[PDB]
Amino acid sequence: MASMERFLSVYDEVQAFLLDQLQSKYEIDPNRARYLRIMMDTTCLGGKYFRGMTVVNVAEGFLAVTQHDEATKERILHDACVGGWMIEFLQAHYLVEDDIMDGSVMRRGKPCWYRFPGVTTQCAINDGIILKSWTQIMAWHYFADRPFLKDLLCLFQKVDYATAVGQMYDVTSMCDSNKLDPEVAQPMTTDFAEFTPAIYKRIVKYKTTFYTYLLPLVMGLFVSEAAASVEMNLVERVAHLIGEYFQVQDDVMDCFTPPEQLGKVGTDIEDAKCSWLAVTFLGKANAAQVAEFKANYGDKDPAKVAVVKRLYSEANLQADFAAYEAEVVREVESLIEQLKVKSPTFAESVAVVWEKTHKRKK
Amino acid sequence: MASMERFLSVYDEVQAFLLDQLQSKYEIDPNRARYLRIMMDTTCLGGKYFRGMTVVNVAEGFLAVTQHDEATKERILHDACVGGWMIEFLQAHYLVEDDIMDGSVMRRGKPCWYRFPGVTTQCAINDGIILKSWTQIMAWHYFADRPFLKDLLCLFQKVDYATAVGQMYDVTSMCDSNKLDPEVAQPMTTDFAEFTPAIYKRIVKYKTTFYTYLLPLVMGLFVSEAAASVEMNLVERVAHLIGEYFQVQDDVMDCFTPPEQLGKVGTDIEDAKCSWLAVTFLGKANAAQVAEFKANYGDKDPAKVAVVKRLYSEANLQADFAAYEAEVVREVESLIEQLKVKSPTFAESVAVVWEKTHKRKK
Ligand SMILES: O=P(O)(O)C(O)(Cc1cnc2ccccn12)P(=O)(O)O
Ligand SMILES: O=P(O)(O)C(O)(Cc1cnc2ccccn12)P(=O)(O)O
Ligand SMILES: C=C(C)CCOP(=O)(O)OP(=O)(O)O
Ligand SMILES: C=C(C)CCOP(=O)(O)OP(=O)(O)O
Ligand SMILES: [Mg+2]
Ligand SMILES: [Mg+2]
Ligand SMILES: [Mg+2]
Ligand SMILES: [Mg+2]
Ligand SMILES: [Mg+2]
Ligand SMILES: [Mg+2]
């Protein structure tokens, strides 16, 4: 695709600036510099680019309906692409750490960064932190001058914090709230009482909807100076909605999509994750299905995992997903309809994002 | 001490705000809220507070020589204390991750956060990231309104990045630059050719002098609006100097201070760290001392470590430290003398910081 290449060319610009700066203000030798180019390529590239592309889409949207000089068109698109990369670098950061926290094996068809032979956990934690700093380095370099800079950075760190908070929700989801205590070794739940639709939704709201949807949509508005031309409550509500759906597909895919298509290998069952499959399962299963699940869930044993998979198939959980999906389509089309009142171009952007998300295979 | 208590009371304010906000905008249950109060207390408290106190000192300095209304005095001190906590929270973040990367056991007389039974590595990585976000949450809450806010946040992230970059230098210091490669398992150096004074100094410049000295000194100026009344090159140079010395003491203490006085247990020998002791040792030892060191360094074996300790004692490395220290006193007093020309009050601040650093025991 010819817009993908234009986005990626801005990466090459950004990568060059970052690496030049390291050699020239941070006294880095070429081998460490090389290491960081590979760390940036490995953790920032080979994804769908839908977070960053989303910023560009929103910006091109306002550009088609507004008068601008050719140079402003250019600047604005360039700003959109750098903004896009901030979010991709923000994601890279989170995935590096997440793969560590989750015990993952592959991502984008390659081993997870920390599993690289010359990397390891000790380095990966810090590479992760580098990824996050890079995002602030870009912002300050490319946007120091822009009227949207405070707003952009205030949003970004609010989104970053929601995500970290959401991450803490996810990684403690298999613990009984009342037993959770830094002094005491955390035992897994036996009741699964907190695998509810409400709690599931809280987890996913924070760990994924802010950075996956809210941030790119609102950033696209910021770099367009168009935030006053939209109902912000509608934007928040639609980003939460689509973002929840996006995480539901992620959960479904963890268990049911073969790793070669997915580019990563599922770990939710092993990890005892409060995943959409698990919550939906516990919502429809009988007494004997529940008990069989309690005795097999949250263990690396390939045979116990096989059982949970067989339980999930038995429970016919694809019916539940069709119902789920049908309701989300209702509400998304609704919210897009509402967005049309003050901003038809933006609601068209939302519709493209939704379309891409709905039709996803990996 | 009665200024320590006033600083800590601002923590209680900040802690309350952060935790209230979680319950009221982030839907946190009391048990997760509790977990984060203990994580904040454990990682933010029980240290010397010299980074944050340093901001307060600098601010009180400009307040004694300037006319202000009683309310501005108050505001400015409050701002200084919140600024101070940003750096303490920034340090907390770095120590949580560092203890993981370094394989440490204790800090401030308690197990390292990740070694807590109810915490673990998976949670600690993220608690760490929370710590860093808290710093931006404070800034934006307390200072959204202040004229120094861009400057403060631009500096902070520049300092944060230098540190992360310095961390990558430290954790790869026992690798031969030319062998370092993400695809290939990293073998320790056999030559120790990169354990030089120049390389040592580059490591420490980035991993410690920016956040330990540059940031608090410059932040104290920012919240005082007094940055134009100082020679910034002199500030940078003195912060680098004192900060290097501070890391040298840290290295010396790692090996030679008993854990009960230190509050942490040394790991530099085991970890193959490019530490001041190692570099100085390699700088004065004979052919047979060097070879004996090469065969014992970078191994957890208590007996190989015993040997490196015995080699360090043999080499009479406390003479070298006295010479080192005598030269730093020369240059610090020099730089403080220079600081007196445009700003005598600030140079007095620097002198207090230096005095505290020089006379430290843990
Ligand atoms: O590993 P993946 O891709 O399956 C999965 O999506 C990863 C993921 C989702 N949301 C976040 C937020 C921060 C870091 C990682 N995140 P999950 O949430 O299931 O770990
Ligand atoms: O663990 P400590 O206290 O001995 C030691 O000081 C810790 C340390 C120094 N500088 C940094 C910067 C970021 C994180 C940790 N840092 P070291 O550098 O020797 O790990
Ligand atoms: C569910 C979430 C938010 C994590 C998976 O992220 P993506 O599937 O967007 O990862 P890439 O496309 O960037 O590989
Ligand atoms: C050498 C450095 C910079 C790390 C040790 O930091 P401190 O010795 O300042 O840690 P606390 O006083 O905060 O425990
Ligand atoms: Mg994961
Ligand atoms: Mg996860
Ligand atoms: Mg997943
Ligand atoms: Mg350490
Ligand atoms: Mg270290
Ligand atoms: Mg140390």
What can you tell me about this protein's structure?
Two copies of one chain form a homodimer. Chain A is mostly helical and 362 residues long. Chain A has one domain: Farnesyl Diphosphate Synthase. In chain A, 72% of the residues lie in helices and 1% in strands. Chain A has 15 helices and two strands. In chain A, strands 1-2 form a two-stranded antiparallel sheet. In chain A, a hairpin with a 2-residue loop joins strand 1 (106-107) and strand 2 (110-111). In chain A, helix 1 (4-25) runs antiparallel to helix 2, helix 1 (4-25) packs across helix 4 and helix 3 runs antiparallel to helix 4. The longest helix of chain A has 33 residues, at 70-102. The first copy, chain A, is globular, with a radius of gyration of 21 Å. The two termini of chain A are 17 Å apart. The interface between A and B is large, with 65 and 65 residues. One ligand M0N is lined by residues 94-95, 98, 102, 104, 163, 167, 170, 207-208, 250, 254 of chain A. The PDB classes it as transferase. Keywords: farnesyl diphosphate synthase, fpps, zoledronate, minodronate, Chagas disease, Transferase. The assembly is dimeric.
